[PDB]
Design a protein around this ligand. Structure first.
Ligand SMILES: *[C@@H]1O[C@H](CO)[C@@H](O)[C@H](O)[C@H]1NC(C)=O
Ligand SMILES: *[C@@H]1O[C@H](CO)[C@@H](O)[C@H](O)[C@H]1NC(C)=O
Ligand SMILES: *[C@@H]1O[C@H](CO)[C@@H](O)[C@H](O)[C@H]1NC(C)=O
Ligand SMILES: *[C@@H]1O[C@H](CO)[C@@H](O)[C@H](O)[C@H]1NC(C)=O
Ligand SMILES: *[C@@H]1O[C@H](CO)[C@@H](O)[C@H](O)[C@H]1NC(C)=O
Ligand SMILES: CCCCCCCCCCC
Ligand SMILES: CCCCCCCCCCC
Ligand SMILES: CCCCCCCCCCC
Ligand SMILES: CCCCCCCCCC
Ligand SMILES: CCCCCCCCC
Ligand SMILES: CCCCCCCCC
Ligand SMILES: CCCCCCCC
Ligand SMILES: CCCCCCCC
Ligand SMILES: CCCCCCCC
Ligand SMILES: CCCCCCCC
Ligand SMILES: CCCCCCCC
Ligand SMILES: CCCCCCC
Ligand SMILES: CCCCCCC
Ligand SMILES: CCCCCCC
Ligand SMILES: CCCCCCC
Ligand SMILES: CCCCCCC
Ligand SMILES: CCCCCCC
Ligand SMILES: CCCCCCC
Ligand SMILES: CCCCCCC
Ligand SMILES: CCCCCCC
Ligand SMILES: CCCCCC
Ligand SMILES: CCCCCC
Ligand SMILES: CCCCCC
Ligand SMILES: CCCCCC
Ligand SMILES: CCCCCC
Ligand SMILES: CCCCCC
Ligand SMILES: CCCCCC
Ligand SMILES: CCCCCC
Ligand SMILES: CCCCCC
Lengths: 341, 332, 345, 336, 339
């Protein structure tokens, strides 16, 4: 009749619905179909090897003792209150590294009851879950991250999880990532674990992030290349301007090994060699070399009947001028070709 | 007693059930008020706000009886609102928000005789907007603010702004921005999540016009000073190679250092920005000046240096003035 | 009469006391006399125009149903657990910007009840409240930071806040601040607000702060003055030593720039020109103009006519060098006096 | 029946009004309280505070809680029944933030003695503030305190007293970064007078000595080495101009970068600090040596060569003496 | 028999069970077996001497009055809501330095009751716990970071902890660490404390961590070796190219000192000498001494006999410097690899 009597009859004091008792106790395992909707990605950081995501988690499952046969409508929407009085799955994220709910003006939770007994329960969640990445190709890397869902206080013979066959993982159209692009395809699979206390059900979802080179491209490569060409121009001055030339070199190298020290300043300390580091080192090697070439040509010119060694110095200067840009172009070509594939 | 009135109001009143369960959806009017519009964190692409959110609707079960009359409305204590039914008004684009109970939960509750209640809870939120960085020194940001339900559908709940002033900010005084006339467009924005249905929404869009004053006197002026210093270095005798060379390398080194220092503080984006293009142009001009000096020195090894020196000292001012005027014409 | 029975006789189930109704319902608005006691100021940072304060907030008011005529003593202190069972005001801070209670070993709050019905209620609060500042005179400014206490769940016809007549804002003896000195006087007035819903009573307190010059004085001025003097030294070098002059000018301008960059990277990115920034801009202009004038002198000497203009422009170059050498200190001194007499007054 | 005995001690059938203070309207109840430091450290001058992790304890007598029925004397209880009796509401006057611990249990110990003595113990983590002066930064000594005082009652009704013997127990394995905690710790009272009445207050003062080693190592030693570096450059004759110019430029750059690295660590305090002044004098000496070489070259470029050599050698014999006297004076005035 | 009545009869209002009384009151003390499952290590930083670990803390103990003799099944899994109604040990971490539970979608806590009365209770915890470490051999050090578990609300006369004889510390196979390697062997000893009041049972677990030498190896040592070899190459050139030599020496000194400055601003400021600091100081001393020697040679260079003396000293130092650097390198590595 009235909504109050029906509400208490479906669950509450009069119903005697034991919330702490799992549906179909000692019966067949209760399968749960769960799909998530990403609402806000971003804030992915390399220092702490994690990223914050915002999701709407949904779970649909059948509770036979929750079925009702009074109202003509098949689907009925209740409020969160009565939601916090019934059985719920104990799914927890295997690598959350902390999280929290949302309680702005209400605990934003949705419960919907179908006629046959199916119930949909959905909550807004924020997860700063971790994702162990690798930096073998740091400026041109592709990262795969995982967000496992699994129970904590039951067993595979009681709880099993299955992703939705269609529309498993949804993404809002307005989704946009800082420094990254999200791949359309989202591989999914199982993660059935074997802990000491039995076997726990587990499913997982994988995201593929691709790092846009743009910011790193400009802010790292362009100043270094400008400094390298500055060293080249410094190298194109006659030896009779002996101090100024070397002075340029003193700056030319110095700023360089500053910029290199800057590049790793925003990256975690990892043992394996990165990908920008080798290009960083090659540029440093080329500049100092140019400085070493200037030192050697000054030595050969000031060795001192006064024409053979001067001509040799001019010849070595010319061959270094015709070689170094060509060698730098060759290095750039192989570096880009090698790291592209 | 006076409290007996609210006791009779609340008896047999289940807050878990919305008004007009089988009836038409309830139209809930929402009014907002900015109290302290905080700055924006470009590093996190978010801004913090502190508002007095207000909701009003119709609850026929709360009609006042014939006994009580009152002047305008009977205001119950703030702690009573746990016994009423409220919409699940949350913020869609919220990153983190919290209540305020420094001395007591800051909620004002008014009850009208006809059965319309007003509930106003203080809120402190950290919303997120997509920060566009193109034309950074003179950007025009637009940060959104969405209000929507989660525990109902369009068949049960509805949000409509007041016909008067939905936003009634008193004073903003942003450290580096300013807002004069916002708009309430994108009024419906009705979300449609597959698997659950249609949810009501309402949007508010601000308009930020960044104060270019700081960067005008913070980055542009030093770069212009360095360029003029390089030009004055150009006016020196080329034979003093120990003198002309350092005053171009200093220019290029200072430009590189300024770019590095002022680039790591802004948020990282994969597209060029006006400040960066200005710095690139200044760096390239200094580099070209140094290269021109180098080619003058090469030509030295007679009046052959004099002609190129005068040609460059005449061409550089006009060229840079043309660049500056086209830049400020295209970006302002 | 046991002590236990009185506590639940005056407030409790047997009392019949409705804590959800303000005193004197449908009557005159009830006064609230409230004074604060600062216990630990500080943590003022310009990065967010906010500061952290620790206060003991106290309130005194009256309630006809709270009067008792049993104990001979007038002041009877009560338990905080019983405190969280009677009517209280709903005061808040208009610009809290983050606050929290204290709960170590107890929810620290003191309740005292007078025989006549007067009630005193005191709590310990921490406020990260914010004050919109101005940086026009940043190294020598006078700042005014305020805190506003106002009701939120009642209108002017029910509540009204009044400060204590004598000793309003008590200050701890051991109070001390870094980079600031707390002025003795503290201002008090009203902030009556007018929202859509009625009129809300409001009071506010204003603290005047003055910034110690010392750290800013030394770091922001002494290196700049020394490098200006060093740039002057270059002017005493003969004309021939061009590389030395160029190098000294480059070093001085680099020092000036850096120092300006270091100075600017401590304050909020405001638009209006500060006080220190214009001073460093003038110093940078001096250094750059000295370098520019040396370059102009070098060009004048190099130009030459085709004893082929003999030493005449060499003379003219020496004349301009000497006149600029005697002029620069005078201009710098007059500018320094102008600046320090304008900003100090 | 342990359950019924506990309930008749405090609970429904006990009839024990927890809100009632012990001996209402009677003499004040003296409370013995001692602290146990378990984890010090995390001291930062930039925020003027430090984090401590203590086992706070309280002891007193409750005559209406005394029992003469249970055979044992000291009976241990649970926190769930602990939050049902009267306890002192001591707080920290300079807490500046703190919280309990809620890991697997509210870690609170309660022990009720037969005669009436009660032992109450709670784990507390305090990020509390002590004002620190950096006037002697390389050799500063700090006095950081911890005030315990009542707030819910008056000194006329509540009194605190430290344990006579062994008050501030310290864990043997306690260690600190760049700090050494002195053994002896001062104690006294801090009776305050607020607006309403006066409240009982107690304190416990900690004397802290900052380790000089790291600072001594990294700041002073390179400075002295490069000063000796400059003297060696001073030994060089004026003919080898490039070598002396290089040895001066390298010294200046190294000294200025060392000073820049040293300065950017401390809060923006107004008055002059102790560490920087010695750094400033060392920079002054390096600049003085470089300027002396420059002046020697200036005079040489202009029979004056004998005078230039004489002034060079007298400066060479004077500068080490000046450095020695300045260093000894500085170390004497700061160490003592 | 409906599950509700059985569950409330085992523990609940109908049971008449008081969770505030420990098992075997006034009897023998209660042994508690507790293993740990490391799930996510990492975030170890020397700047505040602590590391964060996420664990599945489990504990099994026998409660005689919790035994049931109705269901044929032996192991029954329970619900957290009714879990928070029975007696539990109050084990805490003596060096927690902050910690909190997890309440995402549920208070994730597992309870299992056996017929004989043995009960297993497991909770997911996160610990930001502190271990003091020494940086004597920082680029090649090995650290021993411990974590303790001890009671607080009882006595050794009532509670006693004990690790499982088999499979004590189970670590997830997929676990990995940045710049660190987790040693397989793990020490398990006893930390029985004697506080001011009685004795408290205590068991601790010690993890041996090794520092991946690759990152520091490359970043610190390789540039220093390159620049000292560059200084030697400068040393090869004769004395005539004075500006080139002095500029190269300046470049080498500046590079060495900027490498040291950029290397030092990462470690916690400790008084005792590290292992990177001495090596970098020796390299800086070597480059400085090379530049000083070149300056002295330039000073000593009229008569051709002094030119011969200068070239003799140049050649002898040319053959001396690489040998001294090599013997120093061998000495340093052999002394800091076996120590
Ligand atoms: C859930 O699905 C599994 C797999 O088909 C099945 O074995 C189980 O009986 C299902 N449970 C229910 C309650 O439908
Ligand atoms: C706003 O949203 C509803 C949702 O279906 C839509 O039909 C219509 O555009 C609007 N409804 C109103 C204004 O009542
Ligand atoms: C204070 O209370 C008195 C009596 O209730 C009355 O004057 C008024 O309501 C309040 N305000 C002032 C200013 O007196
Ligand atoms: C507490 O100490 C005071 C000291 O003046 C004494 O007067 C009083 O009797 C003591 N009370 C108890 C219960 O020990
Ligand atoms: C518990 O530990 C104590 C330690 O002495 C031991 O004597 C006893 O046998 C153990 N068993 C129990 C549960 O009493
Ligand atoms: C992501 C596309 C990169 C294209 C090649 C850019 C080369 C820039 C350097 C040219 C000298
Ligand atoms: C009390 C403020 C003092 C400001 C500095 C005054 C300096 C005056 C001398 C300038 C040469
Ligand atoms: C722990 C790996 C060690 C690899 C060998 C390092 C040799 C360094 C000295 C080379 C001369
Ligand atoms: C209005 C901005 C147009 C940007 C064009 C693409 C980048 C050009 C870089 C020189
Ligand atoms: C993706 C933007 C690349 C811009 C390159 C500019 C190169 C200027 C020389
Ligand atoms: C080289 C001049 C380019 C000018 C582009 C103007 C674009 C206007 C939209
Ligand atoms: C190092 C590359 C250029 C050649 C150096 C001088 C050859 C003797
Ligand atoms: C004599 C030098 C010829 C050019 C060599 C180029 C090597 C990449
Ligand atoms: C700042 C000096 C300007 C000189 C202009 C030329 C005077 C003949
Ligand atoms: C900057 C030098 C300007 C010279 C103008 C011409 C003077 C005759
Ligand atoms: C050089 C020694 C001075 C006297 C030291 C006295 C220390 C107690
Ligand atoms: C800033 C001075 C410009 C001179 C131009 C002369 C053609
Ligand atoms: C120097 C050119 C300035 C143009 C300004 C246009 C608003
Ligand atoms: C606190 C003021 C110090 C002034 C120093 C002047 C050299
Ligand atoms: C109000 C503008 C002042 C400019 C001063 C420039 C020195
Ligand atoms: C006309 C020259 C005046 C010089 C004054 C020097 C103090
Ligand atoms: C009180 C400060 C007076 C400064 C006078 C400077 C001339
Ligand atoms: C106590 C330290 C004395 C140092 C004396 C140095 C001369
Ligand atoms: C308190 C300042 C002391 C300075 C000593 C200088 C030698
Ligand atoms: C383990 C390989 C080390 C190579 C060192 C090269 C200098
Ligand atoms: C560039 C090599 C040295 C010149 C003689 C082959
Ligand atoms: C894998 C690195 C290759 C570098 C070639 C110059
Ligand atoms: C894939 C880009 C290659 C560029 C080679 C210069
Ligand atoms: C997109 C702006 C280009 C400007 C070139 C001078
Ligand atoms: C407050 C006005 C200052 C002006 C300085 C030129
Ligand atoms: C304008 C300067 C006034 C100084 C008074 C002492
Ligand atoms: C310079 C020596 C001072 C000694 C004071 C006791
Ligand atoms: C340089 C010697 C290394 C030895 C490693 C075992
Ligand atoms: C430089 C040698 C150090 C030896 C330490 C044991």
């Amino acid at each position: 009749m009235s909504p109050s009597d029906f509400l208490d009859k479906l669950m509450g004091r009069t119903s005697g619905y034991d919330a702490r008792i799992r549906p179909n106790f000692k019966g067949p395992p209760v399968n749960v179909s769960c799909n998530i909707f990403i609402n806000s990605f971003g804030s992915i950081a390399e220092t702490t090897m994690d990223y914050r995501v915002n999701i709407f988690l949904r779970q649909q499952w059948n509770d036979p003792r929750l079925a009702y046969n009074e109202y003509p409508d098949d689907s009925l929407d209740l409020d969160p209150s009565m939601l916090d009085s019934i059985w719920k799955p104990d799914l927890f994220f295997a690598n959350e590294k902390g999280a929290h709910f949302h309680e702005i003006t209400t605990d934003n939770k949705l419960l919907r009851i179908s006629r046959n007994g199916n119930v949909l329960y959905s909550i807004r969640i924020t997860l700063t879950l971790a994702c162990p990445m690798d930096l073998k190709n740091f400026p041109m890397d592709v990262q795969t991250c995982i967000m496992q869902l699994e129970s904590f206080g039951y067993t595979m013979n009681d709880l099993i999880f299955e992703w939705q066959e269609q529309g498993a993982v949804q993404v809002a159209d307005g989704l946009t990532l800082p420094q990254f692009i999200l791949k359309e395809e989202k591989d999914l699979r199982y993660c059935t674990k074997h802990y000491n206390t039995g076997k726990f059900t587990c499913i997982e979802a994988r995201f593929h992030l691709e790092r846009q080179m743009g910011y790193y491209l400009i802010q790292m490569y362009i100043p270094s290349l400008l400094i390298v060409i500055l060293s080249w121009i410094s190298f194109w001055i006659n030896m009779d301007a002996a101090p100024a030339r070397v002075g340029l070199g003193i700056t030319t190298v110095l700023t360089m090994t500053t910029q290199s020290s800057g590049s790793r300043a925003s990256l975690p300390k990892v043992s394996y060699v990165k990908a920008i580091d080798i290009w960083m080192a090659v540029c440093l090697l080329f500049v100092f070399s140019a400085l070493l070439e200037y030192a050697a040509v000054n030595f050969v010119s000031r060795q001192h009947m006064r024409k053979l060694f001067i001509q040799r110095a001019k010849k070595i200067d010319k061959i270094s001028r015709i070689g170094f840009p060509m060698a730098f172009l060759i290095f750039n070509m192989f570096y880009w070709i090698i790291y592209k594939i | 007693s006076t409290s007996n009135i609210l006791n009779r109001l609340l008896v047999s009143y289940d807050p878990r059930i919305r008004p007009n369960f089988k009836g038409i959806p309830v139209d809930v009017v929402v009014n907002i008020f900015i109290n302290s519009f905080g700055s924006i964190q470009e590093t996190t692409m978010d801004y913090r706000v502190n508002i007095f959110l207000r909701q009003k609707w119709n609850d026929p079960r709360l009609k006042l009886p014939s006994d009580f009359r009152g002047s305008d409305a009977l205001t119950v204590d703030p702690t009573m609102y746990k016994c009423l039914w409220k919409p699940d008004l949350f913020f869609a684009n919220e990153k983190s928000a919290n209540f305020h109970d420094v001395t007591q939960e800051n909620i004002l509750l008014f009850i009208f005789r006809d059965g319309d209640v007003l509930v106003s809870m203080r809120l402190s939120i950290t919303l997120s907007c997509p920060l566009d960085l193109t034309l950074f020194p003179m950007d025009t940001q637009r940060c959104k603010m969405q209000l929507e339900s989660f525990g109902y559908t369009t068949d049960d709940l509805r949000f409509i702004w007041q016909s008067g002033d939905p936003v009634q900010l008193e004073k903003i005084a942003l450290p580096q921005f300013d807002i004069k006339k916002e708009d309430i467009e994108y009024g419906n924005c009705t979300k449609y999540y597959k698997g659950t249905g249609y949810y009501t929404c309402v949007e508010v869009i601000f308009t930020l016009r960044r104060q270019v004053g700081f960067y005008m006197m913070g980055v542009y002026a030093p770069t212009l000073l360095i360029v003029v210093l390089s030009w004055l270095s150009f006016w020196i005798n080329p034979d003093a190679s120990a003198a002309r060379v350092p005053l171009g390398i200093f220019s290029v080194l200072s430009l590189a250092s300024e770019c590095t220092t002022l680039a790591a503080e802004l948020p990282k984006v994969s597209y060029v920005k006006a400040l960066d293009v200005w710095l690139i142009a200044c760096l390239l001009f200094g580099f070209a000046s140094l290269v021109e000096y180098a080619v003058v020195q090469v030509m030295l090894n007679p009046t052959a240096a004099k002609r190129i020196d005068l040609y460059a000292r005449a061409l550089f001012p006009f060229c840079f003035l043309f660049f500056n005027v086209i830049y400020w014409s295209i970006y302002l």
